[PDB]
Structure 1
Amino acid sequence: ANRATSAFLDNPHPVGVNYVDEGSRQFVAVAELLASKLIDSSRESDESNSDVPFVQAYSKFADDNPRHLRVKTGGKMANALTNVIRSYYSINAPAIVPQVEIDRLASKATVSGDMYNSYAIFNSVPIVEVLSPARTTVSIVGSDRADVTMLNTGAGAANITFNFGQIAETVILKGSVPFQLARLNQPMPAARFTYKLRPLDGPFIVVLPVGNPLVISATAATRIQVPLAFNKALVESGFQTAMNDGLFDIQNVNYYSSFDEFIISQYHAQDGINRVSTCVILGLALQAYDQMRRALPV
C-alpha cells in the first residue's frame, strides 16, 4: 500500500506573531488606502495636465514632498510596510518596526482594522492523502486543479481511498471516463462523470477498473473571512512581487506558487486556525505593496 499527498500541503512553516494587534492592523488598512490613492493620482494627473495630484498623494504617503534628484521610495511607510511583511511570513524574521512608528502611521487616515467583515473564496484543492493498494500507481499533479492519474495493473478491481481534509467546503470531481465513488460503508452508484461532495462527510472510496488509466480532476472551494478591502487579483500580484524582491528570502521556510496555496496549506496545519488570521493580514499588506511598488518602482 502506497500513499500520496499534495506537494503544497507538506510541512507548513510557522508564521509570525507580531503586528497582529489593532494598531498594526489599522496600519495595514491605512497603507492599503493611501497606496490606492497613489495609483489613482496618475489618472488625475493625466486629466489635470499637471503633477500636483500625484505630489499631494505622495506627500501624504511619505510625509515628504517628491524630489527630481531623488528616486521616489515612499519614505517611512514604504520602509515600515516592507519590514512588516517580512515578519508575517516567518517567525524567524525580526520585528524591527517599533510600535510608536506604527501608531503614528496608523493615524494618517481613519480606518477600522476589522479583518472579519467579509469573506473570500480560495480555490486550492487539498488532498491530504490518497491510499491505494499494491499494483496500483497514483500520481497527484496540480494545486488549483488537481489531476489524479490512476492505473490498475492488477488482476481485479481496486479500491482507492481519498481524504480531502475537514476544512474545504465543497469538492467537485470530474473523471476522464465515468467512474464509481461512494463514502465509506455505502453502496456504489452507477458510473457518473461528475460528483459533488463535502469533505466533512468522510473518506471516499473510488473503484478503479483494470484497463486504461483513470484521471480525476478535483476543484475545491473554501471560504475564509477577509476584510472588505480584500482584492484577490491585487493580493496575488503582490505575492509574486514580494517573492521576486526577496522579502520571503529567509532560512528554514517553504515557498509556494501563489497566495492561494500559502493560506490553504497553513489552514491545514496542526492548528491552522491560529495562522489564518495572520495570513489574511499578510494578504492586505501584500495588496498595499503591489499598488505602492507599481506606482513607485525601485
Structure 2
Amino acid sequence: ANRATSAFLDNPHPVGVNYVDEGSRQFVAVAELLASKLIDSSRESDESNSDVPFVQAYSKFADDNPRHLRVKTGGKMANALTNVIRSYYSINAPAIVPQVEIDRLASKATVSGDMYNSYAIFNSVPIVEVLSPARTTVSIVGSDRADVTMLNTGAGAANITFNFGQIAETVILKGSVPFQLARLNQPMPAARFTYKLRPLDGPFIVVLPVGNPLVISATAATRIQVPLAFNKALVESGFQTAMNDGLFDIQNVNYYSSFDEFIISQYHAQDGINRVSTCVILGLALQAYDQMRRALPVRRV
C-alpha cells in the first residue's frame, strides 16, 4: 500500500545538450590542466618569494599580464568555463559561448578530451521504492548512508519489499537487530546482521516482527566511467563553490546536496546513459572551477 522513496531520486531535471562534442571536451580538459598549474605555481611562488612562477602561469591561463589595480579573475578562460558549467546543469541555461572561443582555448595545451579512460566509485544509496503493508510505517533518511526505520504496529509479521534499482553494483545492508531477508519467492534464511546484495537480483522481502522498530542501514557502490584526471575530492569542493556563487540558480531545476547525489539521480532516469556522459564533463569542469577560484580568490567576508 504505502510507498516510500529517496528524496534525492525524485524528478531529475534535464541536463544540457551543448558543449558535448570532441572540441568542447578538449576545452574542459585544457582548463583543468592549466588550473592545476595555477595552484602549483602559486605554492611555488610563496616558497621562492617571487611572483614570477605565478605571473608566468597566469599568462598561459588568461593570455594577459595582470596590472596591479585590476582584479585578477582568469580572463576569457574563466568567463568561458563559468558559463559552460551553467549550460551543463540544465536545458534552460543560455549556452552563449561561441565556438571560436572554445576552439582557441582548446589549443593552449596538447591534451585529449577522453571521458572514458577510467572509473570512479560513487557511494549514494538508491532506494527507488519501499512498498509496505497498511499497518506498518516506513521512513527513509539519508543519501550517503540510508537509514530505513520501519515499525510494525500490525498484529502479525509483515513483508516489506525493497527496490534498489538496477544501476548500483553492490548494496550492503545492516540492521539494529538481526533480521530476515531473501529474494522474491525464495526461502527465508536465518536472522543475520549483514546482507550483501546484487541490486539486479530482484525485489527483496524483509520480515518485520511485531514489537520494537527495526532500522536498516544501507550502503551502495556504483562505478561510473570518468577521465583519468578525475578527483572526487576536488569535484565536490567545486560543486559547493558553484552552488554558493549562484551558478546553479536556474528556474525549474533540482538542487542536490552533493555531486554524488547529482550523478546517481541522473543515472536513475530515462536516457540516463546519455545524461551521465554530460554529467561527467560537468564534473571535470567543476574540478577546474575549484582549482582556479582557490588560486584567484575574489569574495571577501
TM range (shorter): over 0.9
State the Cα deviation string for residues 239-283 of structure 1 (Å, max 9, x = none): 000000111011010000000000000000112111000000000
Deviation per residue, 1:79-130 (Å, 9 max, x gap): 0000000000000101110011000000000000000000000001000000
Find the aligned partners of 1:296 and 1:120 in 2 and give their Cα distance: 28
Query: Please, which runs of 5 or more residues in structure 2 have no aligned partner?
Result: none
1:97 match: 97
**For residues 94 and 47 of structure 2, what CA distance do their matches in structure 1 show?**
43
The answer for unaligned runs of 5 or more in structure 1 is none
Which deviates the most, 47-56 or 231-240? 47-56
- Which residue pairs with 1:58 in the alignment? 58
**How far apart, in 1, do the equivalents of 2:134 and 2:86 lie?**
45
Aligned-partner Cα distance in 2 for 1:166–1:152: 28
> Post-superposition shift, 1:47?
2.7
Query: Matched residues in 1 for 2:115 and 2:188: separation?
Result: 43
Q: What's the CA shift string for 1:212-262, capped at 9, x where partnerless?
A: 000000000000000000000000000000000111011010000000000
User: What SS class does the counterpart of residue 260 from structure 2 fall into?
Assistant: helix
- Report deviation, 1:42: 1.5
Q: What does residue 146 of structure 1 align with? A: 146
- 1:46 positional shift: 2.2
Counterpart CA distance in 2 for 1:95 and 1:256 is 22
Shift of 1:68: 1.0
CA distance in 2, matches of 1:43, 1:223: 34
Separation in structure 2 between the aligned mates of residue 43 and residue 19 of structure 1, nearest angstrom: 32
- C-alpha separation between the residues in 2 aligned to 1:116 and 1:296? 30
How far residue 43 of structure 1 moved from its aligned partner, in angstroms, is 1.8
Q: Percent identity?
A: 100
Distance in 2 between the 1:49 and 1:281 partners?
Answer: 36
* Equivalent position SS for 1:256: coil
Q: Would you say how many aligned residue pairs link Structure 1 and Structure 2?
A: 298
Shift of 1:149: 0.3
CA distance in 1, matches of 2:104, 2:192: 60
**Structure 1 Cα separation of the partners of residues 147 and 47 of structure 2:** 49
How far residue 71 of structure 1 moved from its aligned partner, in angstroms, is 0.7
Q: RMSD of the alignment, in Å?
A: 0.8
Shift of 1:202: 0.2
Q: CA deviation at 1:48?
A: 2.0
How far is the alpha carbon of 1:17 from its aligned partner?
0.4
Rounded to whole Å, the distance in 1 between the matches of 2:120 and 2:36 is: 20
**Structure 1: distance between partners of 2:163 and 2:152:** 20
Equivalent position SS for 1:199: coil
Deviation of 1:44 (Å): 1.2
Q: 1:120 and 1:90 mapped to 2: Cα distance? A: 23
TM-score calculated relative to the size of structure 2: 0.98
